[PDB]
Amino acid sequence: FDYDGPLMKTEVPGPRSRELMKQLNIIQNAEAVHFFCNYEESRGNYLVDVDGNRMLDLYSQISSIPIGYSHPALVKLVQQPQNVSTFINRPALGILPPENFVEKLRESLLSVAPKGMSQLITMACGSCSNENAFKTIFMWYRSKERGQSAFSKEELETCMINQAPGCPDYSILSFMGAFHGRTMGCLATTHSKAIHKIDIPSFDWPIAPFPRLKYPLEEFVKENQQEEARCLEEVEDLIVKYRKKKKTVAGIIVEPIQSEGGDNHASDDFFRKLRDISRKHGCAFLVDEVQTGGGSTGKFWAHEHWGLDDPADVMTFSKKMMTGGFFHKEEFRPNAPYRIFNTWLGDPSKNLLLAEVINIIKREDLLSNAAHAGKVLLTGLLDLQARYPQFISRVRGRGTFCSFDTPDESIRNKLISIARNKGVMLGGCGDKSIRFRPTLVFRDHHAHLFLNIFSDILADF
Amino acid sequence: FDYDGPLMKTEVPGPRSRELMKQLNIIQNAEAVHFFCNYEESRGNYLVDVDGNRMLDLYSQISSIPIGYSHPALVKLVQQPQNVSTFINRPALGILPPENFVEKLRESLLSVAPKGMSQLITMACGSCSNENAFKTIFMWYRSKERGQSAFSKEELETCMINQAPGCPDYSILSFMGAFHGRTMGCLATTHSKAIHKIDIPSFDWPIAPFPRLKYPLEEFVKENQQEEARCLEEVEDLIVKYRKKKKTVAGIIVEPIQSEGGDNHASDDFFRKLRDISRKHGCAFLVDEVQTGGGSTGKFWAHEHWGLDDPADVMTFSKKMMTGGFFHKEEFRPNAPYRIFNTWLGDPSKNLLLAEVINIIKREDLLSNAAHAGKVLLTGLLDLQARYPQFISRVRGRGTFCSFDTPDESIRNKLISIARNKGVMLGGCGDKSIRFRPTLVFRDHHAHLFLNIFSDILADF
Ligand SMILES: *CC[C@H](CCC(=O)O)NCc1c(COP(=O)(O)O)cnc(C)c1O
Ligand SMILES: *CC[C@H](CCC(=O)O)NCc1c(COP(=O)(O)O)cnc(C)c1O
Ligand code: FES
């Protein structure tokens, strides 16, 4: 189920959107709002707004809508009378799970478990996924140190009043350009944009450089090899340095592709070596697939491209997955209950939808489709780069997870704004990059639709 | 719609529950699981399990089910064809809200706004509500320090690498016995149980004593006055002490009644004075109504009992309210977008349900019913206390938000376990307290039902 193409009636945001934006602005800061949407009339790759505009959506609610708007298979789930309870009786999952909790996990998340990770805990978003992944890692690392010994009296007393040794001074190593959420734990590992970080208390945790590749890749083989090697060495130096400061690095967190910080890529070789460094120093390797997970790179999890039997110790997810959570190795299993815990731990209604999402992905061969449609997209971007080097540079991607840079922030926003008025929703990341996050029902013909619109925009820009 | 009473077939957990518990334990630590539930057959005050047991539920998924299981008005919402899109098309609310977003907020959360708070931001749970309330407070504090001037270059650079002055060393003051969530920010303000806190890095923030009242209240007027006065003085000393340490207290967080820490109450006078101390020192007063909010104390928000025109600067909520979020004063409104932000910011499907919940609460006069049924409950508990002083002490409550202590942790768990096998789900809090969190369709005839069952339990104990 999909429309034949975009259809614009007004500038965006249009009159009805601007009116709803003014109403909402009374109650909260609404400057981020792009426009107001008619989700009821939205279908497949097309988002319809309240002014009747119908746009090809290559941003997908910031990479969170897996198989398009109003998918008929999802419609049918909500229509089934047996599913009513799931939507209106939300359980405290940690204590009172529903009968079908394990089976529905088998139909959904367990059927796509990463290699070597038998454990799974669910969470409602990417932030509590990473926060609880951090805690799982701290618990594991302390467990290694104390061995078979019990918690000590001193630890039980001091931990209640936020003091060592009960509350250790351990760290998670993160990368410049990273984004892992905005709760105060996650935020410490985030290094995306100053407006995200400023005025908020943080943690003194080590921050390593993420490789900046030069393009085109075939003209910078040696330079990119040396850049990645410099970054890996600086990661290792930081682990050593923080051990000496007695702020031991318990874990390393990284995105397979840095999203909010500007679609920064690195070679599979780089991630394989980073994983080895993690193991070498006893650091848990935490891979954040909140935005890369769900198939858009051509594999269900982006880390699968690395080709490792032991890719990671913990892996977080959300967005496309409908629910959050994290897979992990058996050895990271909490020793006691009520340590990794909260009221809802996700939502069974989201698991119900996800099981069907995953079924659609497999039956409609959507992983391979993302590789194919992404290849068409990227080929077209490379052509546009060759024809408009004054506006387009550093064209890059994997699957439909693509992007390019513009000369400055102002042109970037202008091109997004023109594209939108011409029927194509694009996203921005970093200071001057445009990014693509198409849903999994985006095909080679949607890529051409976009490419023809953007070609005309560029010609008289 | 409700059953006539409990009906037990087996001990709890029964065979089918124990089997499902074994399956779940492969994938995660499942020791917290009480039993598995048949939500499809649950109605009103009665939770039905997978072994056919039907129990009067006075715990309500840890105080998160507002108007009982399978409420007919909520069933009808899910059955409406126009509501399908809301459940299957989840928006990135911060950028692309649905057409009805503001109106549905008017039907729900804005209709129950606390006094003096015109602003509202939504969140998906209690933990991100408090985390973002903390950040809202830190931003407000720095903003009042810097005035109507720009971010400095030094601040913009240092904040990206987790350093002052971009990342200030400010604090939130919290109370012993408190519980505000388990993400690393929230967890710093939590002082409930050592298993919650141990092995997790924390923040050096001030921790004040919460008053431990003596019962019965009319025999300890002077002693409880002096206990509360001592606590208020210690709060103020801590604010002064942390100002000198250059870890300025930007805000104070408190529950109107401490839940997870053991149902600790204080007088309305105490909270009024705490609010005054907050204002006096320029600290934002953050009231956490995640568990007290939604009517069970006899007012929609528990802080309403205080009778203040200016009760707080910020107020968080979740659980009963379906979605999370927080209300706040206009002056706490963020100056720029993308500071308080995340992908989903709650869920429109939860707002849809909440609008109906609130309509039911008002039309069925459920606030007044909680006061009355709670009075019947508490009167019965006082009678049982008089008859069984060897097992029951410190009977206390407001509305149906009631509790009592037992002599030790072991008897507490034993009485919960006996009660459950006799058809009544009770909750525990603190080390040795039993607590009540009945849904809002708990009537007095349910109170008598409980009191008659438990009275027989105590005679046989
Ligand atoms: C996909 C967009 C979102 C960024 C929005 C923003 O806050 O600026 N990405 C989130 C993200 C998280 C946190 O997930 P959530 O709390 O927003 O649900 C964690 N890890 C990654 C890699 C991303 O992108
Ligand atoms: C209602 C019980 C729940 C405790 C669950 C747990 O984590 O042990 N209360 C949580 C709570 C929060 C955090 O809510 P959430 O993250 O579980 O949604 C915040 N503030 C209060 C007062 C409570 O009790
Ligand atoms: S922190 Fe993840 S839903 Fe609130």
Curated annotation (Swiss-Prot), chains A, B:
Q: Which InterPro entries match?
A: 4NH2But_aminotransferase_euk, Aminotrans_3, Aminotrans_3_PPA_site, PyrdxlP-dep_Trfase, PyrdxlP-dep_Trfase_major, PyrdxlP-dep_Trfase_small
Where, by residue number, does substrate bind? Answer: 182
Q: Does the keyword Ribonucleoprotein apply?
A: no
Per the annotation, how and in what number is the cofactor bound? Binds 1 [2Fe-2S] cluster per homodimer.
According to the UniProt entry, its GO molecular function terms are: (S)-3-amino-2-methylpropionate transaminase activity; 2 iron, 2 sulfur cluster binding; 4-aminobutyrate:2-oxoglutarate transaminase activity; identical protein binding; metal ion binding; protein homodimerization activity; pyridoxal phosphate binding; succinate-semialdehyde dehydrogenase binding
Give the N6-acetyllysine positions (modified residues). Answer: 214, 241, 280, 375, 414, 432
Q: What is its main location?
A: mitochondrion
Superkingdom to which the source organism belongs: Eukaryota
Q: Subunit info?
A: Homodimer; disulfide-linked.
What protein family does this chain belong to? Answer: Belongs to the class-III pyridoxal-phosphate-dependent aminotransferase family.
Q: What is this protein called?
A: 4-aminobutyrate aminotransferase, mitochondrial
User: Which organism encodes this protein?
Assistant: Sus scrofa (Pig)
Q: What is the lineage of its organism?
A: Eukaryota, Metazoa, Chordata, Craniata, Vertebrata
Q: Its encoding gene is what? A: ABAT
